[PDB]
Each structure stands twice: as C-alpha cells, then as structure tokens.
C-alpha cells in the first residue's frame, strides 16, 4: 500500500511573531525520510528541510523540522510575512514518492516548456531544460499539481542510463525520456482528459522548476 502522509490542518491562522508547528503523520515508518516544502500562489515548492531535521542552503534559522518513524513536524519560530504560504510535507522512503495534502499558513536551474491547450484524446510533450550542475548525476523527478489541489509525484529518471520509475497510476499515460546532448528531460502524456490539465513541474534533489501549465479544453 502507498504511503499516506496526513497534515491535519488545510489552514492554520497566525501573526507575525508568532511560533507555529504543522505535522504529517505517516501511515508507515519511513525512518527520517522526510522533506518540507513552502510554495506561494503562482510558484514552484521551495525546499525547507531534509532528512526530517536538515536545513536546506539558504533557509532562514526560523524554520527547524524534527521528527522519526512516523510523526514529523515542521516549527517557524518567529513568523514573518513572508512564510504565510502553503506548506507540505513528502517521504522519499519508498516508491511512490507521496506529499502530505497541504497545510495553509495565513545556481541549478530547471526552465519548463511545452504546456499549452491541447485537445482531448491527443498528447503532449513538456520538456524541462536543465543547467548549472551535471546533468547525469541527479535523478530529475516529475510532478503534477492540479489548480488549487496537492502534489501528486508521476515518476523519475536517470539521466546517465534513463533508468525510469512510475507511480502505477501513470505507468502507461506517461512516458519519461532524456536527451544528454542537450541537457533536457521530456515526459509525454497520451489520452488527455480534464483529468490531466494542471501544472506540471520537474524536479531535482533541492531545486523544482517552475512549472508548466497544460490545458485539455
């Protein structure tokens, strides 16, 4: 069974200066496999915390996670206006990779292409231009996110050999490929449906990009 990550609380209110502590609940131990993310309206997930307590480069000191096995918690100590955003947790234990549904607080580059209208039944094919790091050393992940809902992870690939992992739910409806030449990753959607229109965003260790928005209309 999938690893269901529970944050019990859509909305959270706070002031500035204020402390505020969000979890997320496991619903299997995945040992101190844990990150944290913040993301803004309009914007990719920024990276928070790793390995359940690490802090990523260039995180404010406000923000400390803790947490093993199957509760982790994300505190910011003193609230600025700027962390009011969403927040979200995600394992990276075992596959497939999954997030926690969100929680309302109120020089590697990866550049997306490719989203646009596309006609129901028909494909499309996004691709994600990577740059500043080698690009055969770092599994680039690929991520769907409906407007206004969650993250839900479709799959990854590495660059070197294009070794590809595939949540079941996409296993046919998309494909992951790579072209070292260039330095680009592509992934292919077949049989669009409303289903499938949303922002997709490809993703390395520490850094997303930032997003590319398909329409089936």
């Known amino acids: 069974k999938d690893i269901v990550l529970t944050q019990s609380h859509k909305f959270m209110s706070t002031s500035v200066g204020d402390r505020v502590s969000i979890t997320c609940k496991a619903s299997?131990?995945?040992?101190?496999?844990v990150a944290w993310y913040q993301q803004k309206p309009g914007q990719s997930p920024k990276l928070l915390i790793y390995?359940?307590?690490t802090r990523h480069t260039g995180v404010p000191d406000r923000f400390t996670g803790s947490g093993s096995g199957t509760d982790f918690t994300l505190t910011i100590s003193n609230v600025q206006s700027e962390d009011l955003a969403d927040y979200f947790c995600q394992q990276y234990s075992s596959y497939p990779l999954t997030f926690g549904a969100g929680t309302k607080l109120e020089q590697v580059q990866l550049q997306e292409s490719g989203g646009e209208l596309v006609r129901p039944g028909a494909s499309v094919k996004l691709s994600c231009k990577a740059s500043?790091?080698?690009?055969?050393?770092?599994?680039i992940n690929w991520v769907k996110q409906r407007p206004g809902q969650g993250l839900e992870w479709i799959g990854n690939?590495?660059?070197?050999?294009?070794?590809?992992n595939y949540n079941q739910k996409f296993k046919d409806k998309a494909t992951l490929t790579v072209d070292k030449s260039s330095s680009t990753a592509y992934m292919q959607l077949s049989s669009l449906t409303s289903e499938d229109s949303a922002v997709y965003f490809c993703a390395r260790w520490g850094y997303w990009g930032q997003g590319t928005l398909v329409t089936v209309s």
């Open positions: 690939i590495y660059p070197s050999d294009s070794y590809t």
């Open positions: 390995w359940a307590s």
């Open positions: 500043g790091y080698t690009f055969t050393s770092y599994w």
């Open positions: 299997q131990d995945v040992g101190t496999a």
